[PDB]
């Protein structure tokens, strides 16, 4: 019968409770017990605090009124408030110290994953303090995970008034018996109970979650570590820049701070960074997740030479110019990782820092043709298969769902055996018509890639491999250079195409190179090990990129 879960903010989704700081202050300043809490609730439904919680006045208008109540209370109690007593200081510190209650958020996230409608119902204020951004940032992080956020100061009603509960029920489109309501204030829980809602008085989080698990029949405690937050394509800001007459680049954009340009590989999408986008934005960065040239909503001209590294890099520099960005940190994976090393070598003034997942930096051999190197290693046979225009396109485009389900597999999921691809006559000749779904992806996520690839197919993406000679000639111009800007190389233990050992000599050309290494990780780094990718990238960004 239960299908909705409602959470309070202070003392439930965020700890320590801002309210509990009035008690801590009394103790720290040796004031009479309850003095501050009494001045706070002074006047009850007609008092200054209710006016604040209903949105009649702002927090900065409330501060002097709370101070006057504090003076009145101290007078009656026959005590003196200290020399430099400040309600502003006390509240600034309390609000700043209040952080998200991670296990409570995890429980809300699990209930919503299981089909519950979730909401935050809170008695809050209109915050106009100079330091208001901290609270704004917290409310943003929290709210994205819920169906509804109901704030007393916006609705002009306050808990425990019965009208706010009828408003919640109307917002939820649910009858009281269908709702679990969690609150740390027993008085605010009473009208929900009186209406017939399941109520949980929250003291310690663990007990509250045990009651929540018992009543919902859903495992919320001791659960496995969840995946980082992903992206819903229709909820993102989509950006479009024309870099030249027939070429436009599409990107997804989230967050504020230093620009972080994410560059996917083959045959991928901006969506390959879905687990990184929210995390990097939350870490204090402005994420620009590209659809590389030839992919998704970006233009896909047919000509091979439109996909040589020199032109791709020139376009990424134009992309920055048109957005008015002097620099970006460039993070690439696979072919994207190759491009980012080239951006660092040719346009260091535009590259704040550079990081590559899997793709090593190997200097060009000015004596050997690049095709000779590919022929020497049996693992790179698929690249010769990719050479003849039309051959790989026909195979990869034949059945899109089959293509992505065969490609996107974890290291233990029987990934494509790429030896003798040319001899066999294709990539999927020993592959099932209907592959099983990898643990890394949902059916819906595969259908997103299928839909994206319906627009342009595989011509542009395969063209990235068709400029060996052109790329070699351009790379030779960089032979006397070193990469001296901040650089990170992330190796994936079980990537059998871009093996960790291929990166071993990078320090000869990148002396200050920093590294990351991910164990039990295949080629599809971002979706294989998203938590670890996020951990490595955020740590390096905060230390080396600002």
Ligand X SMILES: COc1ccc(NC(=O)Nc2cccc(-c3ncn(C[C@@H]4CCCO4)c3-c3nc4c(N)ncnc4s3)c2)cc1
Quick one: how far is CA 453 from the chain centroid? 24
Say what the alpha-carbon torsion angle 100, 103, 106, 110 is, to the nearest 10 degrees. Answer: -150
Quick one: how far is CA 87 from the chain centroid? 36
Asked if 172 and 4 count as a contact pair (C-beta separation under 8 A), the reply is yes
Q: Radius of gyration over alpha carbons of the chain, in Å?
A: 29
Query: Was 184 annotated as part of a binding site?
Result: yes
Binding map of ligand X across residues 415-444, x = CB under 6 A, - = no contact:
-x----------x-----------------
Judged by CB under 6 A, the stretch of 130-138, 158-166, 333-341, 526-534 that binds ligand X is: 333-341
* Residue 143: contacted member of ligand X, a copy of itself, none (CB under 5 to 8 Å, by partner type): a copy of itself
Give the bridge partners for 490, in sequence order.
357, 516
Beta carbon nearer to ligand X, 251 or 404? 404
Q: Residue from 82, 115, 217, 480 that binds a copy of itself (CB under 8 A)? A: 480
Judged by CB under 8 A, the stretch of 49-57, 363-371, 423-431, 532-540 that binds a copy of itself is: 49-57
Beta carbon nearer to ligand X, 2 or 418? 418
Beta carbon nearer to a copy of itself, 33 or 546? 546
Asked if 357 and 537 count as a contact pair (C-beta separation under 8 A), the reply is no
46 part of the interface to a copy of itself, by CB under 8 A? no
* Residue 480: contacted member of ligand X, a copy of itself, none (CB under 5 to 8 Å, by partner type): a copy of itself
Closest CA to 20 of 71, 89, 91: 91
* Residue 485: contacted member of a copy of itself, ligand X, none (CB under 5 to 8 Å, by partner type): a copy of itself
| 517 given a catalytic annotation | no
Q: What does the block give as tokens for 31?
A: 């004031």
| 334 given a catalytic annotation | yes
Residue with tokens 């040589």: 308
Contacts for 429-438: CB closer than 8 Å, 24+ residues apart: 431/402, 431/406, 433/399, 433/402, 434/402, 435/402, 435/405, 435/406, 436/405, 437/405, 438/405, 438/408, 438/409, 438/410, 438/413
Q: What does the block give as tokens for 400?
A: 């899109």
Quick one: how far is CA 421 from the chain centroid? 37
Taking each helix axis as running N to C, give the angle between helix 162-172 and helix 186-195, from 0 to 180 degrees, rounded to the nearest 10.
60
Query: Was 232 annotated as part of a binding site?
Result: no
Asked if 73 and 35 count as a contact pair (C-beta separation under 8 A), the reply is yes
292 part of the interface to ligand X, by CB under 6 A? no
Beta carbon nearer to a copy of itself, 400 or 475? 475
Q: Residue from 58, 373, 401, 431 that binds ligand X (CB under 6 A)? A: 373
335 part of the interface to ligand X, by CB under 6 A? yes
Name 522's Cβ contacts closer than 8 Å, sequence gap at least 6.
409, 410, 411, 415, 492, 494, 495, 496, 528
Annotated catalytic residue: which of 465, 495, 528, 544?
465
Cα distance between the two ends of the chain:
50
Judged by CB under 8 A, the stretch of 81-89, 254-262, 362-370, 438-446 that binds a copy of itself is: 254-262
Cβ 440 to a copy of itself shortest distance, Å: 25
Binding map of ligand X across residues 237-276, x = CB under 6 A, - = no contact:
-----------------------------x----------
Beta carbon nearer to ligand X, 50 or 373? 373
Quick one: how far is CA 299 from the chain centroid? 26
Query: Was 10 annotated as part of a binding site?
Result: yes
Cα gap 78→32, rounded to integer Å: 10
Judged by CB under 8 A, the stretch of 195-203, 300-308, 404-412, 477-485 that binds a copy of itself is: 477-485
Residues that bind ligand X (CB under 6 A): 266, 334-335, 338, 359, 362, 373, 380, 382, 407, 416, 427, 471, 475, 497-498
Catalytic residue set: 334, 465, 523
Residues that bind a copy of itself (CB under 8 A): 51, 55-58, 60-61, 126-128, 132-133, 135-137, 139-140, 143-144, 154, 156, 234-242, 253-256, 259, 278, 281, 286-287, 321-327, 346, 348-350, 352, 477, 480-485
Summarize the annotated binding site for Mg(2+) as residue ranges: 8, 10, 184
């Amino acid at each position: 019968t239960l299908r909705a879960a409602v959470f309070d903010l202070d003392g439930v989704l965020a700890l320590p409770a801002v309210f509990g700081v009035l008690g801590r202050t009394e103790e720290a300043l040796a004031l009479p017990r309850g003095l501050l809490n009494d001045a706070f609730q002074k006047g009850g439904p007609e008092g200054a605090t209710t006016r604040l919680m209903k949105g009649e006045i702002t927090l900065s208008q409330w501060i002097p009124l709370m101070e006057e109540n504090c003076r009145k209370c101290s007078e009656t109690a026959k005590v003196c408030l200290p020399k430099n007593f400040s309600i502003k200081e006390i509240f600034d510190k309390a609000i700043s110290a209040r952080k998200i209650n991670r296990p409570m958020l995890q429980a809300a996230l699990m209930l919503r994953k299981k089909g519950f409608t979730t909401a935050i119902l809170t008695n809050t204020w209109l915050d106009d303090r100079a330091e208001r951004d901290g609270l704004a940032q917290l409310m943003c992080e929290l709210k994205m995970h819920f169906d509804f956020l109901i704030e007393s100061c916006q609705v002009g009603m306050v808990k425990p008034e019965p009208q706010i509960y009828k408003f919640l029920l109307d917002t939820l489109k649910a009858s009281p018996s269908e709702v679990v309501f969690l609150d740390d204030i027993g008085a605010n829980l009473k009208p929900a109970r009186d209406l017939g809602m399941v109520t949980i008085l929250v003291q310690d989080t663990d007990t509250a979650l045990k009651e929540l698990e018992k009543v919902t029949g859903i495992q919320l405690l001791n659960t496995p570590a969840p995946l980082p937050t992903s992206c819903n394509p229709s909820d993102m800001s989509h950006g479009y820049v024309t870099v030249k007459p027939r070429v436009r680049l599409h990107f997804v954009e989230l967050g504020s701070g230093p620009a972080v340009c994410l560059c996917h590989g083959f045959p991928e999408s901006w969506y390959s960074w879905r687990y990184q986008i929210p995390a990097l934005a939350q870490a204090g960065y402005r994420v620009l997740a590209m659809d590389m040239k030839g992919y998704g909503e970006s233009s896909a001209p047919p000509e091979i030479e439109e996909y040589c590294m020199e032109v791709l890099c020139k376009e990424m520099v134009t992309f920055l110019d048109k957005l008015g960005l002097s620099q970006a940190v460039f993070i690439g994976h696979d072919w994207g990782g190759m491009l980012v090393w080239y951006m660092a070598l040719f346009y260091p003034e535009r590259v704040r820092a550079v990081a590559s997942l899997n793709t090593p930096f190997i200097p060009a051999n000015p004596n050997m043709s690049p095709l000779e190197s590919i022929k020497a290693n049996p693992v790179f046979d698929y690249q010769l298969y990719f050479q003849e225009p039309g051959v790989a396109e026909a195979e990869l485009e034949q059945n899109l769902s089959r293509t992505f389900k065969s490609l996107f597999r974890a290291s233990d999921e029987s990934v494509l055996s790429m030896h003798k691809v040319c001899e066999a006559g294709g990539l999927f000749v020993n592959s099932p018509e209907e592959p099983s779904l990898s643990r890394m992806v949902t059916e819906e996520e595969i259908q997103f890639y299928v839909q994206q690839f319906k627009k342009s197919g595989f011509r542009g993406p395969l063209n990235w491999y068709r400029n060996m000679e052109r790329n070699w000639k351009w790379a030779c111009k960089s032979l006397g250079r070193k990469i001296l800007i901040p650089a990170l190389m992330v190796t994936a233990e079980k990537d059998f195409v871009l093996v960790p050992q291929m990166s071993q000599h990078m320090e000869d050309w990148i002396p200050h190179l920093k590294r990351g290494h991910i164990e039990d990780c295949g080629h599809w780094t971002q979706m294989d090990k998203p938590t670890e990718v996020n951990q490595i990238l955020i740590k390096w960004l905060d230390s080396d990129a600002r």
